[PDB]
Design a protein around this ligand. Structure first.
Ligand SMILES: CCCCCCCC/C=C\CCCCCCCC(=O)OC[C@H](COP(=O)(O)OCC[N+](C)(C)C)OC(=O)CCCCCCC/C=C\CCCCCCCC
Ligand SMILES: CCCCCCCC/C=C\CCCCCCCC(=O)OC[C@H](COP(=O)(O)OCC[N+](C)(C)C)OC(=O)CCCCCCC/C=C\CCCCCCCC
Ligand SMILES: CCCCCCCC/C=C\CCCCCCCC(=O)OC[C@H](COP(=O)(O)OCC[N+](C)(C)C)OC(=O)CCCCCCC/C=C\CCCCCCCC
Ligand SMILES: CCCCCCCCCCCCCCCCCC(=O)OC[C@H](COP(=O)(O)OC[C@H](N)C(=O)O)OC(=O)CCCCCCCCCCCCCCCCC
Ligand SMILES: CCCCCCCCCCCCCCCCCC(=O)OC[C@H](COP(=O)(O)OC[C@H](N)C(=O)O)OC(=O)CCCCCCCCCCCCCCCCC
Ligand SMILES: CCCCCCCCCCCCCCCCCC(=O)OC[C@H](COP(=O)(O)OC[C@H](N)C(=O)O)OC(=O)CCCCCCCCCCCCCCCCC
Ligand SMILES: CCCCCCCCCCCCCCCCCCOC[C@@H](O)COP(=O)(O)OCC[N+](C)(C)C
Ligand SMILES: CCCCCCCCCCCCCCCCCCOC[C@@H](O)COP(=O)(O)OCC[N+](C)(C)C
Ligand SMILES: CCCCCCCCCCCCCCCCCCOC[C@@H](O)COP(=O)(O)OCC[N+](C)(C)C
Ligand SMILES: CCCCCCCCCCCCCCCCCCOC[C@@H](O)COP(=O)(O)OCC[N+](C)(C)C
Ligand SMILES: NC(=O)N1c2ccccc2C=Cc2ccccc21
Lengths: 1273, 119, 173
């Protein structure tokens, strides 16, 4: 009832006084719909005029026993105050209190606070401020203290409930104000400035709605405790393994053999300091800051002649890349898990240790890097789903009319829309014809075409504005959008490159008839509508991190610049000003946090840089993951509610095509009428026998064996095969036997099944094609035409012989069926991605078409400073004088749209993007020498692309593929689509190990002493003691480092042996107690196995370091100690269920990995055939090339995770001199030239990184998600 | 480069004076590259006298107006470069300058002290 | 790149032959200046006699009646960084059967460092009148043929047995 708006008065105070007396004599829950900060329930109607902003009687009967009152605001919101006098001094009936209450509840007050904070956030962004900013900061301090004073006068400082301090954000405000006065009066200055950034967090309190978003983020991070415990445990175990294997291996360097003046290695090392001193004694690659790593094994790196490998000096990367201590190994393993610049660590470790150590990296990448990330993503997805389900549940709970009608007949016809769409597509494909060396006539025709198109669109705008008044035309969003684009077109016509590319957004008018291009627009709209608060929170967090980093490290980056740059000039990525600080933060969010962090530590301290970078990484990645998953789930579920019918009013394009097909039918019928008016019993048994043979298990197994042999025979064709002439001969004759073998299998299948039943089968078609290629090659070789151009090039298709195992192997067939099922949606999303990226490609072409050229000194590879050689003519004149000068260009650039696509791919995958960004921000003009950051703010182009392109396009791709797989599963009837029928039974049986009830306790024995042992060992105290013992053993394993003294080594050995005896004793006690019942438990036999292997390993390691010298075997055998610490899983129910999810998911991951390995084998054979002789550049070096099956597999595993593919592609884009030598003679071989094939290289790498994107990530995520959902149930 | 020196240093006649000249370069003080140039001038416009220096070892020029009373009292390895002075005569009243260059740093610092002799 | 293929060991009389001596560096990016000398110990002789020396793109054949006007350079050309040091006998006789040695003197140029190394490679060469076939080729051809015939015989035996059984069962039905 609206009569409840009674004022809080003296009689009300007296009534509360009598009620409190009755409460004292007395020696429920408040209404949620009436809680402060919400609107009044609609039962209370409209506020009376004299009651707004006045202390009203408490409307909630829950607070009828307490001196609390209510003040109502214009805008219908409730503030819940306290009637206990403020400061024990000012009663609620006071002029100051009334005025302050009105001020605090007014909305102009909140708007003023918001404006003040947003203004101060701009003065926060000055690396050095002008001397007059002290008055501005005094003004800001005055405004903040006035606001706090008003709040305190309104609701009491800290006197009971609903006072100033009772809100946790008022704590932040109070801390801000005391710091502001203490720093101005009591007066590290940089640390105090970092505390000025605490004033930015008041935006969350001021702006409505951000507080609940922050609370949701915190309640989400509270759900990740088990996953982070598992992550820390896994990283610790892998760090212990790495510290065992690679301890000190990264200190290997090549040292001079011949030393003068009786000098020794230690005498040399006690004197050197500078890199110019080290370069005289150790082998340094040209343009390298670190000494070249070598190794003592056969497959490690090779020192040059006259240099020998020794372990001395510091680790690479300023000394931060190492396994020499547990902390550094942990940092390396965290880097490996997050896959940030991990390929450099891969190559360094392989070179220092050996190429057989890639198994460690394989296991780490495919167990910790992918599975833990998928677990984190799945847990966050569950958290969002439950939160959204709760939200849904709570929500549920005279002469002018002549032309008006004429142009309305004209322009609103369905055909006009189709014509406009055709014109839009033509305009896009006409803008996409720009390149760098464009002749003047081509430029003229492009200008004329653009003029014609903008004229057509302007005429169409004028026609639709005279056919219907502005009051109705400007009522449509598409009409407003088209109007903006066209008026921009006329502006640019009357007057740039940007405003020319503004026209390209007209492509989004095809989203009406393109359902999977409307999903992209829905995602983009959700990012600024439903999830606008999440986006705003992310922006605020990024701003805060950028300003904090600048305030902390800007002065250090300028003081200590010679420690990180030889020229003593600021590097490319630094934190000396706000823009570069923001760039560093954004790069960290993109996922590159180690290369900038090394310079951070070098200039300003390991502790500070590590703390700041870890905070940034964790919080920023959490917020970005929340936004990503929210967008994905909201767009791909909430949009599915069957809102309106499927095109109720058919689109003008649909009506136009309906009319067109009607006219086609009419023309067909009329033309048809016009032209008609004008004018053996043994054969069946043979076939049955062939069927019986081809269907036999022996025949199938024989064929599978021959397929495997013929696939493996391809791996012996290295470049070193001329050293293996007997093997060459053997492999040639074996090829003929195999062709004869697969030709007879082909003829029996023809006579056994029938031509139709054969040729209507894709697997048989594939086998038919492969054996046809083999037969043609054999015939051509027999006739002597073995070198006939295309015939020779046809010999490279022998790498497809492995493709005959897909049909043979059931798991690989099951997996490959899902991909074929999902192909159409892949094509749809790929077309959407290409159309979307065409806009950015055309924009980049118009921005940087031909501006990446520069005049380099080819010996140093250093650009000549633009003071000398300011253009290409001066570069040419300088070449005429010198010799090692060149006017070079980047290999991946923006010269045309085709190369723009490759540059955009490199940017979007974050591999090789830095070179393009550097060239783009250096670019001056065409035929002009680039200057250092002449166009600095071209970084914004790449930022916007990485956001709109790299992020929303992955939100669209993941959604459509996960929907396709779900639809396939539902088509099969809720059956797993990655598991075979034989594996389904194992999966079903394993699913029952996660729910079996506890069995009966093992009965007590008969002997008295045995019973006492039983009561001792069956105890929670015993279990806890075993757990703490394992923890202590883990700590003793962590305390081991490189260079530890022999005394510490011996004491650690004895500490370990006593742990061995303790665990063996507990096992023996449990055996003598539980009799034969001990082995009925999986954890018990695991403990027994661990005990015996630990004992055996200790003995064997002692043997292999006493009667035999084999350090590698000793290091490997000492890994048996990790069994003692793997037992912590037994008592951790939080991580045990996640490991059960992994165990559940193993069967499907096996099939996926089998398919991936076959694909990698095929690509390795192709790489060996083609890129075996390219020039050693960039990522193609002496140890990572395509000259051998092992090297090829190493490179392909490296780029399966999409790492270093730019550096492997770069040497292949060479094709003409002086980049390559087409007539180079290779010793020991008949091949000539070291040039690459650009088209083949581009296709190879793009298709291989496309296969990995849809397999190692799209098939991996799905399997892990379903099985986590199963294990957590 | 930031050099911290007292603008005015008051000492009594017949007492010892330590001229506090310190800096805080980021880089390590390479003794093979450090350069010192202590100078004295009777007034700001007066010319400067070259009296104590570091090149590889601390070299004191032993000027007659200072006799054998000037020695080194800091430590470049810990960024203190002060100079001591026994029994400060009333003639010692003047302006003392410490100029520090520490490769690979680029900026060059200067510390100035006005030494005053009290009765 | 550079693959150290060994030389052959059999030259036919009256034809041309090539003696391979390939020596690659441990690292392919290092600079060097190489020159070579070839010796020869004829079958039935106890001493190795120097026959030629190649340095700075000029072959200096020692006065030898056995090798005068028959040997030409046949290795890496146009550089001082020789990695293939092969010579090419343009007309084999019977005075070319013996033990050859290919001395390689390579001088690596490093940074403030010059290393002068040396390698020796020995090639035993026997002269014949008719080119013998490879034992590996002969055995490969023979085993290929026997495998083909064995597999075909097994397949045909299975086919005939299965045909008789299938037809007998069908006529029984
Ligand atoms: C919400 C907020 C969340 C984040 C909160 C903060 C989280 C983590 C803080 C980690 C840093 C802790 C240590 C601080 C620095 C310190 O006290 O460093 C002590 C030693 C120094 O060693 P040194 O003298 O040999 O260094 C010189 C080596 N030279 C000569 C080769 C160059 O540090 C070492 O050894 C190694 C130091 C680094 C160890 C790896 C840390 C990896 C952390 C990952 C985060 C996981 C989540
Ligand atoms: C989410 C999306 C994932 C996929 C992203 C894209 C993947 C990568 C895209 C393709 C890379 C294209 C590389 C082309 C490089 C061209 C290099 C070049 O120098 O230009 C060669 C020719 C132009 O002839 P020219 O200059 O030699 O004339 C000679 C005239 N004289 C003699 C006077 C000089 O360029 C041409 O052929 C241009 C026409 C063919 C290549 C561009 C066509 C557009 C690309 C296709 C769309 C993507 C395909 C599917 C990708 C995955 C699915
Ligand atoms: C480098 C570092 C080197 C460290 C290695 C140290 C040596 C490690 C030993 C390897 C494993 C030893 C044998 C483990 C077999 C465990 C077993 O016996 O497992 C039994 C269960 C199902 O047995 P159940 O339910 O019928 O009764 C028994 C289970 N109960 C009553 C608890 C439900 O099977 C399962 O989960 C099987 C799950 C096994 C997953 C792989 C474990 C190895 C890692
Ligand atoms: O099945 C397609 C049918 C029947 O075939 P089938 O093997 O008798 O079937 C066995 C089956 N159990 C049955 O009921 O009975 O068979 C058909 O109705 C097949 C129709 C397609 C016609 C194909 C005829 C020839 C097939 C292959 C002959 C190869 C010719 C020679 C090859 C090269 C020779 C060197
Ligand atoms: C990174 C990995 C680092 C090492 C991790 C630990 C390796 C050793 C694991 C234990 C080996 C001995 C197993 C003995 C029998 C274990 C057993 O009963 O298995 C089944 C158990 C099931 O546990 P749960 O609490 O019911 O699960 C949650 C409910 N649902 O589930 C389990 O305990 C099985 C877990 C197996 C390990 C995970 C797969 C590895 C591949
Ligand atoms: C450590 C214990 C060493 C032996 C002392 C313990 C001992 O003998 O009594 C305790 C247990 C008794 O189980 P059990 O020998 O299988 O006998 C039960 C019976 N044979 C049955 O299963 O019906 O004894 C055993 O369990 C010993 C045999 C276990 C298997 C051998 C390997 C471990 C040693
Ligand atoms: C050429 O390859 C043919 C072989 O594989 C022969 O294998 P089989 O299919 O003959 O093996 C036995 C066949 N039956 C009689 C059991 C069906
Ligand atoms: C340059 C040359 C590049 C060549 C690339 C060739 C790629 C080939 C990829 C493998 C392509 C091999 O075929 C894939 C099969 O899935 C197609 O047949 P289906 O599986 O649809 O047949 C029905 C199966 N069930 C349902 C009866 C079991
Ligand atoms: C990505 C990871 C790639 C490697 C995964 C290795 C998993 C290694 C662990 O495999 C566990 C098995 O349950 C699944 O393998 P299977 O398919 O062999 O089990 C069923 C037996 N049949 C199907 C062969 C008869
Ligand atoms: C799928 C997982 C990733 C791919 C794994 C492929 C199988 C694993 C492929 O491993 C290849 C490496 O072993 C090659 O390096 P190695 O050091 O072994 O080469 C030794 C060569 N010599 C010294 C004997 C001549
Ligand atoms: N499990 C699901 O079905 N979804 C959904 C649910 C709704 C809409 C789309 C998608 C697609 C992908 C995806 C990704 C991560 C977690 C869940 C998830």
């Amino acid at each position: 009832g609206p009569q409840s708006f009674v004022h809080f008065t003296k009689q009300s105070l007296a009534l509360i006084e009598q009620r409190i007396a009755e409460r004292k004599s007395k020696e429920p829950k408040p209404s949620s719909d009436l809680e402060a900060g919400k609107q009044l329930p609609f039962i209370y109607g409209d506020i009376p005029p004299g009651m707004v902003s006045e202390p009203l009687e408490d409307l909630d009967p829950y607070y009828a026993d307490k001196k609390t009152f209510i003040v109502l605001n214009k805008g219908k919101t409730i503030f819940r105050f306290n009637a206990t006098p403020a400061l024990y001094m000012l009663s609620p009936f006071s002029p100051l209190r009334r005025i302050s209450i009105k001020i605090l509840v007014h909305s102009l007050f909140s708007m003023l606070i918001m404006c003040t904070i947003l203004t101060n956030c701009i003065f926060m962004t000055m690396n050095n401020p002008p001397d007059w900013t002290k008055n501005v900061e005094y003004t800001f301090t005055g405004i903040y203290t006035f606001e706090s004073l008003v709040k305190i006068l309104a609701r009491g400082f800290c006197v009971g409930e609903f006072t100033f301090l009772r809100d946790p954000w008022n704590w932040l405000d109070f801390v801000v104000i005391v710091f502001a006065y203490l720093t101005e009066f009591v007066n590290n200055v940089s640390a105090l400035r970092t505390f000025r950034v605490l004033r930015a967090l008041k935006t969350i309190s001021v702006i409505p709605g951000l507080k609940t978003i922050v609370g949701a983020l915190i309640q989400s991070v509270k759900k990740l405790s088990d996953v982070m415990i598992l992550t820390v445990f896994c990283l610790s175990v892998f760090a212990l393994i790495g510290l065992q294997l690679f301890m000190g291996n990264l200190k290997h360097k090549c040292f001079r053999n011949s030393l003068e003046n009786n000098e020794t290695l230690e005498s040399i090392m006690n004197t050197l300091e500078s890199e110019e001193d080290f370069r005289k004694y150790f082998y340094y690659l040209e343009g390298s800051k670190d000494a070249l790593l070598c190794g003592f094994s056969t497959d490690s790196g090779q020192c040059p002649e006259g240099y020998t490998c020794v372990k001395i000096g510091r680790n690479p990367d300023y000394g931060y890349t190492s396994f020499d201590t547990f902390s550094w190994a942990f940092l390396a393993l965290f880097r490996l898990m997050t896959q940030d610049y991990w390929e450099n660590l891969y190559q360094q470790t392989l070179r220092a240790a050996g190429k057989t150590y890639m198994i460690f990296f394989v296991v780490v990448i495919f167990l910790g890097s992918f599975y833990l990330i998928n677990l984190i993503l799945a847990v966050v997805a569950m958290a969002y789903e439950e939160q959204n389900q709760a939200n849904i549940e709570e929500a549920k709970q005279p002469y002018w009319i002549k032309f008006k009608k004429c142009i309305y007949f004209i322009v609103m016809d369905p055909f006009v829309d189709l014509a406009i769409t055709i014109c839009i597509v033509l305009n896009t494909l006409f803008m996409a014809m720009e390149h760098h060396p464009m002749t003047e006539e081509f430029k003229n025709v492009l200008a004329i075409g653009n003029l014609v198109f903008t004229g057509i669109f302007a005429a169409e705008m004028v026609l639709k504005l005279i056919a219907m008044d502005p009051y109705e035309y400007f009522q449509v969003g598409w009409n407003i959008f088209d109007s903006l684009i066209v008026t921009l077109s006329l502006v640019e016509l009357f007057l740039l490159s940007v405003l020319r590319s503004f026209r390209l957004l007209r492509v989004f008018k095809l989203a009406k008839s393109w359902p999977t291009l409307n999903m992209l627009i829905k995602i983009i709209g959700n990012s600024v509508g439903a999830l606008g608060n999440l986006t705003l929170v992310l922006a605020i967090i990024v701003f805060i991190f950028a300003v904090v980093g600048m305030q902390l490290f800007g002065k250090s980056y300028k003081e200590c610049v010679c420690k990180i740059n030889d020229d003593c000039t600021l590097p490319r990525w630094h934190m000396n000003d706000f823009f570069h600080s923001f760039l560093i933060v954004f790069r960290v969010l993109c996922g590159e946090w180690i290369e900038t962090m090394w310079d951070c530590m070098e200039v300003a301290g390991q502790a500070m840089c590590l703390i700041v970078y870890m905070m940034v990484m964790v919080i920023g990645n959490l917020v970005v993951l929340n936004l990503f998953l929210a967008l994905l789930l909201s767009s791909f579920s909430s949009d599915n509610l069957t809102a309106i019918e499927e095109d109720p009013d058919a689109n003008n394009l649909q009506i136009a095509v309906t009319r067109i097909k009607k006219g086609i039918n009419y023309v067909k019928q009329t033309l048809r009428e016009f032209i008609l008016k004008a004018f053996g019993k043994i054969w069946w048994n043979i076939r049955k026998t062939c069927y019986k043979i081809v269907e036999h298990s022996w025949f199938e197994s024989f064929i599978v064996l021959m397929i495997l042999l013929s696939s493996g025979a391809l791996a012996f064709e290295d470049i070193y095969i001329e050293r293996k002439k007997t093997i060459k001969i053997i492999l040639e004759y074996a090829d003929k036997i195999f062709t004869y073998i697969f030709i007879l299998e082909m003829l029996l299948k023809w006579i056994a099944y029938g031509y139709k039943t054969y040729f209507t089968n894709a697997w048989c078609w594939l086998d038919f094609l492969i054996v046809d290629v083999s037969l043609v090659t054999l015939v051509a070789n027999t006739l002597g035409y073995s070198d006939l151009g295309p015939i020779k090039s046809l010999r490279t298709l022998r790498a497809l012989r492995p493709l005959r195992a897909l049909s043979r192997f059931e798991g690989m067939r099951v997996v490959v069926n899902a991909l074929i099922g999902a192909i159409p949606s892949i094509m749809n999303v790929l077309l959407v991605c290409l159309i979307f990226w065409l806009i950015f490609s055309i924009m980049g072409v118009n921005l940087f078409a031909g501006k990446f050229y520069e005049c380099i000194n080819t010996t140093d590879g250093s650009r000549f400073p633009a003071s000398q050689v300011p253009n290409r003519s001066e570069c040419f004149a300088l070449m005429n004088v010198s010799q090692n000068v060149r006017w070079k260009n980047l290999k991946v650039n923006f010269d045309n749209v085709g190369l723009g696509y490759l540059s955009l791919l490199q940017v979007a995958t974050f591999k090789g993007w830095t070179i393009i960004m550097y060239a783009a921000v250096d670019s001056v003009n065409v035929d002009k020498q680039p200057k250092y950051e002449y166009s600095l703010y071209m970084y914004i182009y790449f930022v916007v692309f990485i956001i709109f392109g790299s992020f929303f396009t992955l939100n669209l791709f993941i959604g459509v593929i996960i929907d396709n797989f779900n639809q396939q599963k539902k088509k099969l009837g809720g059956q797993d689509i990655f598991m075979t029928e034989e594996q389904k039974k194992y999966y079903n049986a394993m699913k029952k190990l996660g729910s079996k009830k506890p069995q009966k306790p093992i009965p007590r024995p008969g002997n008295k002493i045995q019973g006492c042992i039983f009561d001792l060992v069956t105890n929670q105290a015993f279990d806890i003691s075993i757990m703490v013992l394992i923890c202590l053993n883990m700590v003793t394993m962590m305390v081991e480092k490189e260079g530890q003294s022999q005394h510490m080594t011996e004491v650690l050995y004895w500490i370990n042996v006593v742990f061995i005896i303790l665990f063996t004793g507990e096992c023996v006690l449990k055996l003598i107690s539980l009799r034969h019942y001990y082995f009925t438990v999986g954890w018990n036999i695991f403990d027994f196995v661990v005990v015996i292997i630990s004992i055996v390993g200790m003995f064997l390691a002692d043997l292999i370091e006493t009667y035999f010298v084999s350090p590698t075997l000793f290091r490997v055998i000492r890994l048996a100690r990790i069994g003692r610490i793997l037992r912590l899983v037994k008592g951790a129910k939080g991580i045990r269920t996640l490991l059960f999810a992994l165990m559940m998911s193993l069967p499907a991951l096996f099939n996926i990995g089998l398919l991936l390995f076959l694909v990698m084998f095929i690509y390795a054979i192709f790489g060996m055939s083609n890129f075996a002789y390219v020039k050693k550049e960039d990522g193609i070096n002496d140890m990572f090339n395509f000259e051998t099956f092992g090297n090829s597999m190493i490179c392909l595993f490296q780029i399966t995770t999409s790492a270093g593919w730019d550096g492997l592609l770069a040497p292949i884009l060479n094709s003409k001199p002086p980049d390559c030598d087409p007539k180079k003679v290779h010793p020991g071989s008949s091949v000539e030239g070291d040039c690459g094939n650009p088209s083949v290289g581009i296709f190879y790498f793009v298709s291989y990184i496309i296969i990995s994107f849809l397999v190692v990530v799209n098939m991996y995520i799905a399997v892990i998600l379903e099985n986590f959902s199963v294990a957590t149930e | 480069m930031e050099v911290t020196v007292p603008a005015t240093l008051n000492v009594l006649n017949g007492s010892d004076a330590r001229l506090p000249c310190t800096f805080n370069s980021c880089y390590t003080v390479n003794h093979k590259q450090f350069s010192l140039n202590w100078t004295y001038q009777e007034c700001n416009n007066c010319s400067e006298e070259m009296f104590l220096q570091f090149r590889m070892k601390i070299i004191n020029l032993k000027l007659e107006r200072f006799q054998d009373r000037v020695e080194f009292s800091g430590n470049p390895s810990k960024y203190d470069v002060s100079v001591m002075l026994r029994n400060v005569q009333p003639e010692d009243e003047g302006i003392y300058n410490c100029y520090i260059m520490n490769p690979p740093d680029r900026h060059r610092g200067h510390g100035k002290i006005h030494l005053q002799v009290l009765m | 790149g550079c693959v150290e293929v060994d030389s052959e060991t059999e030259a036919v009389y009256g034809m041309t032959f090539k003696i391979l001596c390939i020596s690659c560096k441990r690292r392919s990016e290092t600079n060097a200046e190489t020159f070579t000398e070839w010796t020869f110990r004829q079958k039935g002789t106890e001493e190795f006699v120097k026959i030629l020396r190649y340095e700075n793109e000029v072959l200096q054949l020692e006065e030898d009646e056995r090798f005068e006007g028959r040997v030409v350079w046949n290795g890496s050309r146009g550089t001082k960084d020789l990695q293939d040091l092969s010579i090419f006998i343009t007309n084999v006789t019977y005075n070319h059967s013996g033990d050859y040695e290919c001395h390689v003197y390579r001088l690596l140029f490093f940074e403030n460092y010059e290393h002068n190394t040396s390698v020796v490679k020995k090639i035993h060469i026997e002269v014949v009148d008719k080119a013998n076939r490879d034992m590996a080729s002969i055995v490969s051809e023979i085993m290929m043929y026997v495998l083909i015939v064995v597999l075909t015989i097994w397949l045909v035996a299975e086919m005939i047995y299965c045909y008789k059984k299938i037809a007998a069962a069908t006529e029984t039905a």
